[PDB]
Symmetry: none
Subunit: 226 residues, 3 copies
């Protein structure tokens, strides 16, 4: 709260050596202790550095391939921002985790591509971004179809699960926006408000039908296993 | 009339004598013979007794614990109340089975608890009580969450299946209520009727999201099996 | 031409002579050769002729009562009409594959009935007929209930999967009709257009509930093992 943040800054001082070099071993070890010691302190002012530093170690991990360790750095980034409560960094980690997922898809590593999609769905859910959640759901659907071609089934089933959980979360946000527009129509009836509510109902039916579309894929994946 | 029916009332007295003597097991065996002879006669009047009588045996067990015998008596009650067609008794069977299911959950027997939550669902769907069907789902979710901690995974799948079939039955009722409101919208196109139809659609979508969220939680219970 | 091609035309002629003879069984074997060679040509038409000819083999196999051969004839017709387009040919196959499904029923062959319902759901989904896809999903439900009464559980799971796929396909088509109705509401927003949009919204929710009902039964079958 007040008397243990200095232990994290010195753990951040032992972390920033990976700027001149490209070491990922000491970068993930320092990121583990940084996001850990900062979370127990509960000081959102030290969580803003470890979250931004994790974006710096994940950006360098994105270079030179290294997608296997880039997701481990984005996992640290989302854990720091999830407990801090900042909505802007969660949107940046979500968009950056999508790159790690699309890169790992090209690298042939669907396991890392799925793990990067989970982090992308992890930050987008907590931040409440409906446009990002549906995007993570469609990226996880491509990883699932890619794993189906790779004959993996291990990641394909987990990729549909992330696609379903991401699209289900976006369906809740649209549902909340529809009930916010419903209470606005109350005590204020108008043809312009009715049209605005009808447009949200269509968006909700669109997110529901796509959610059932992903739901049938996850049942299809489970049916191939059993 | 007087045969294949007198045998039903004799089984009721054989059950009534057991309730005062004890051993509710023998009371259910008599109530099982009663509902069998009552269903053969097809008299809705005798079916209301064996239903309300078997309900009494279920409450006799509740104080004695023995939730295994309570569900057997609640299944006889819901089977007799279903063939009779009296929704008042079916609404009482649903509430009593929720009690047995919550007590079997406190006792740790989540298997009997799920069987009781199934009996509660059977009664609430036959009577057409959406407010009870949504209530049954809440309990069947609690039993599923309870089966998660106990390690009994087969019950967790069966409990989420029951929470799904209850939410599904509630969605059909709201869908029927929506088609009646759409029927009153075809006649007299009015701004006030539109607001009421818009109000039901949001409730139908909100129930659909709750059903797809229960379905997603059920598929999560299926993907956990290694 | 001559090479690669023509091999399908001569196979179709052998099929036409087999239809005149009424062997039907051999007619499917030649038609299988014809649709494979026509895919090698990758040419519009030819396939269109193989699709329309194979339908006739499936029609005369209904008169013969050989529903087993009829589902292979419709499988070649749905595979040829899929590559050639012409959704009126696909709609013609789905109508014939449902007739095969009902004829496969009642006789007792629920496995072939499931194969016929898949073909009907294959054509109607490609053509985009929600009224046929809904009709395929209802017949696939009749196969699943009958497969339970006959005792074969593997066919019952396959029948519910086809029922869900044809029901999910029709739900996507109705969603597109609703999006088109919403865009017409944005350009002309008044009471009468709102009434028609709300009428489609009810049809979209009614299909969504019927799709979730089949999804739950497929999950129940997946809960086993």
């Amino acid at each position: 709260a007040l008397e243990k943040d200095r232990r994290a800054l010195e753990a951040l001082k032992r972390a920033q050596e990976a700027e001149k070099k490209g070491d990922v071993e000491e970068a993930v070890r320092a990121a583990q202790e940084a996001v850990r010691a900062a979370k127990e302190s509960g000081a959102s002012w030290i969580l803003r550095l470890v979250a931004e530093q994790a974006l710096r170690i994940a950006k360098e991990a994105e270079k030179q391939g290294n997608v296997e360790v880039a997701v481990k750095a984005a996992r640290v980034a989302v854990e720091a921002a999830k407990q801090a409560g900042d909505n802007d960094v969660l949107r940046k980690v979500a968009e950056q985790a999508l790159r790690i997922a699309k890169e790992a898809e090209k690298q042939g590593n669907v396991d890392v591509a799925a793990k990067a999609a989970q982090v992308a769905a992890e930050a987008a859910k907590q931040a409440g971004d409906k446009d990002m959640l549906e995007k993570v759901a469609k990226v996880a659907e491509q990883i699932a179809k890619a794993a189906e071609k790779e004959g993996d089934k291990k990641v394909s089933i987990d990729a549909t699960r992330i696609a379903l959980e991401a699209s289900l979360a976006a369906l809740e946000i649209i549902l909340e926006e529809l009930k916010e527009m419903l209470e606005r129509l109350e005590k204020n009836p108008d043809k312009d408000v009715i049209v605005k509510v009808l447009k949200v109902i269509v968006k909700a039916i669109e997110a529901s039908v796509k959610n059932q579309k992903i739901s049938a894929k996850n049942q299809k994946a489970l049916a191939e296993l059993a």
